[PDB]
Amino acid sequence: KWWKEAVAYQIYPRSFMDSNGDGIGDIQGVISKLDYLSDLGIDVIWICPIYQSPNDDNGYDISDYKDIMKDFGTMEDFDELLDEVHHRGMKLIMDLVINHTSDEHPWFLESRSAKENPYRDYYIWHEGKDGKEPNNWESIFSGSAWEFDEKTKEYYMHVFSKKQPDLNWENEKVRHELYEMVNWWLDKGIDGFRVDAISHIKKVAGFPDLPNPEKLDYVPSFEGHMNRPGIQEHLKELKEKTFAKYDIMTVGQANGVTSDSADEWVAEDGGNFNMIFQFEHMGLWKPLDLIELKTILTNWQNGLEKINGWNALYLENHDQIRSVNKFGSTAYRVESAKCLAALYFLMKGTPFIYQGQELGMTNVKFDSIDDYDDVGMINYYRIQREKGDSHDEIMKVIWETGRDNSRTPMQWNTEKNAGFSTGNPWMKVNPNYVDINVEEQKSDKNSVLNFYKQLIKIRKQHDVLVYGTYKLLAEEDSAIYAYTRTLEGKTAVVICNMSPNNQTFEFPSSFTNIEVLIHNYPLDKNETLEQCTLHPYETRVYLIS
């Protein structure tokens, strides 16, 4: 229940704060900015992976689960971080990455060393078919999901990068070692986990070929490994052997789960996580189809209410483009950032803020493929270039859909590199840091940052915004997203003009008192309550007694 009332902040440590001038974020960097997060009102910090890693996938390829990434510091730095976080009245959850390891993990080095060895079946090996790969599956990062090993003359599976071989969850020995490792971390007093790629751990037995109607070189392979029947057996054991033994929060990153199939994932009774990151609102690729967004988020509000589940609320993370671009408007950057904030943050659930979201940071446009880092898009670039796509065509996809958009340095001030580093950043800063930065926003009472500060405050001060029942209003309005939160004798009315235009809206009325809790435009003297005249991306929250 503390996790129900919490607001969480997600840190991408490579790009949060560089404390020693090599252009790479680090743990002492995070420590140096804990004042910022405490003052924001954050309750829980989720930090992306900080473990030993070759960084083929920036931390999500782990070669030692019990050692800190050299770039980021030492275990002593981590211990200091956890101690400082805890003394500041915050909690910290770690990123648990156990679908796959680095190919430089000692388990895999042994596993690949000989066709027969005690670690061979820790991973997923198969001989080829017809002088090619074992099947036609595509990696999520493009190319084959199988990599040939010359020494042992077999392929190993990698859903993600070539340097991320999948662990074999059908091997009890593997599961036992993972559970020991998880509990080792929990014994240090961390407060839980965000659980990476967790819907991918069950593969269809025998890894059969997928249908290939369009005759591709490789077939997108989600139907072979995403949320496959049999997965719940593993996740139930994971919970029983680890999570259930501690008072922690868990949020599972669970692609392929829908609002009607979330029962075994988050139900109060028997659910394997406290909440999940669901993907249904993150694949709406013009004018945003607002009513489709209403349908999806409302499905999840109503769906989880029915099974006493709990939503994880979010619009941004290290895998997505920036939300002003995705859901708002660059023509109304500040206003749409605040509108989006009220919209997602005040539904029923635990809200997550991704670093820079609270500033209204936006997408970046680098001209050179050398300026990007994301293994996914770098692969995409090579493959599509060879197939004949022009540089421009490809960069368009990268600019408009690439997750590197969310990985540019956190924008602290207007000094060199926006104060992220004294050195040359591993990823270039967005040039708009001259306009968009923490220092500027602290002093402006109408900044995006101070709007988030207010959202956190009113959610904390009014129980109806935590435990109140959600109901969608004005479903057919293609511009206005409005909804209520109701708890006993209190009703909050959240009104969001999700359009770049002025709009009229009838107040969806029976109250003894009304109060405006938050608003991103100045209130108009002569405006009547009943006839809202809302400015582009205007949001208001009313509290009704």
Ligand X SMILES: OC[C@H]1O[C@H](O[C@H]2[C@H](O)[C@@H](O)[C@@H](O)O[C@@H]2CO)[C@H](O)[C@@H](O)[C@@H]1O
**Residue window 39-78: x/- pattern of binding to ligand X, with contact defined by CB under 6 A:** ------------------x--x------------------
20, interface contact from Ca ion, ligand X, none, CB < 5-8 Å by kind: Ca ion
187, interface contact from Ca ion, ligand X, none, CB < 5-8 Å by kind: none
Comparing CB distances to ligand X, the nearer of 3 and 12 is 12
Contact residue for ligand X among 110, 149, 264, 319 (CB under 6 A): 319
- Neighbouring-strand partners of residue 45: 9, 92
The distance of closest approach from Cβ of residue 388 to ligand X in the complex, given in angstroms and rounded to an integer, is 25
Q: Determine the residue type at 74.
A: T
* Structure tokens belonging to residue 116: 């027969």
160, interface contact from Ca ion, ligand X, none, CB < 5-8 Å by kind: ligand X
* Alpha helix ranges (H) inside 60-171: 75-87, 106-111
* Structure tokens belonging to residue 229: 């029947």
Residues forming contacts to Ca ion in the complex (CB under 5 A) are 18, 20, 22, 24, 26, 170, 524, 527, 533
Q: Determine the residue type at 62.
A: I
The distance of closest approach from Cβ of residue 95 to ligand X in the complex, given in angstroms and rounded to an integer, is 8
CA distances, 483 to each of 295, 327, 541 (Å): 12, 18, 10
Pairing relationship of beta strands 91-96 and 146-149 according to DSSP bridges? unpaired
26, interface contact from Ca ion, ligand X, none, CB < 5-8 Å by kind: Ca ion
Contact residue for ligand X among 8, 178, 197, 449 (CB under 6 A): 197
255, interface contact from ligand X, Ca ion, none, CB < 5-8 Å by kind: ligand X
Task: Write out the binding residues for ligand X, residues 363-422 only, by CB under 6 A.
Answer: 376
Which residue in this structure is represented by tokens 């959600």? Answer: 470
Task: Write out the binding residues for ligand X, residues 124-153 only, by CB under 6 A.
Answer: 140
Are 42 and 437 in contact by the 8 Å Cβ rule? The answer is no
Phi first, then psi: give them for residue 505, nearest 5 degrees: -150, 130
Are 99 and 140 in contact by the 8 Å Cβ rule? The answer is no
Phi first, then psi: give them for residue 24, nearest 5 degrees: -115, 130
57, interface contact from ligand X, Ca ion, none, CB < 5-8 Å by kind: ligand X
The distance of closest approach from Cβ of residue 80 to ligand X in the complex, given in angstroms and rounded to an integer, is 26
By CB under 6 A, residue 196 contacts ligand X: yes
By CB under 6 A, residue 253 contacts ligand X: yes
Comparing CB distances to ligand X, the nearer of 57 and 71 is 57
By CB under 6 A, residue 318 contacts ligand X: yes
Contact residue for ligand X among 255, 311, 329, 499 (CB under 6 A): 255
Are 96 and 182 in contact by the 8 Å Cβ rule? The answer is yes
Q: Determine the residue type at 64.
A: D
The distance of closest approach from Cβ of residue 376 to ligand X in the complex, given in angstroms and rounded to an integer, is 6
E-only strand ranges, 70-225: 91-96, 125-126, 137-138, 146-149, 154-157, 192-195, 219-220
Are 537 and 497 in contact by the 8 Å Cβ rule? The answer is yes
Comparing CB distances to ligand X, the nearer of 100 and 540 is 100
43, interface contact from ligand X, Ca ion, none, CB < 5-8 Å by kind: none
Q: How far apart are CA 128 and CA 130, in angstroms?
A: 7
By CB under 6 A, residue 84 contacts ligand X: no
24, interface contact from ligand X, Ca ion, none, CB < 5-8 Å by kind: Ca ion
Cα 124 from chain centroid (whole Å): 27
**Residue window 447-486: x/- pattern of binding to ligand X, with contact defined by CB under 6 A:** ----------------------------------------
By CB under 6 A, residue 280 contacts ligand X: no
Comparing CB distances to ligand X, the nearer of 60 and 155 is 60
- Neighbouring-strand partners of residue 64: 52
With CA atoms as reference, report the closest residue to 17 among 365, 382, 328, 411.
411
Q: Provide, for the chain, the percentages of residues in helix, strand and coil under a 3-state DSSP scheme, each rounded to the nearest 5.
A: 35, 20, 45
538, interface contact from Ca ion, ligand X, none, CB < 5-8 Å by kind: none
* Structure tokens belonging to residue 175: 């599961």
Binding site for ligand X (CB under 6 A): 57, 60, 97, 140, 160, 196-197, 253, 255, 318-319, 376
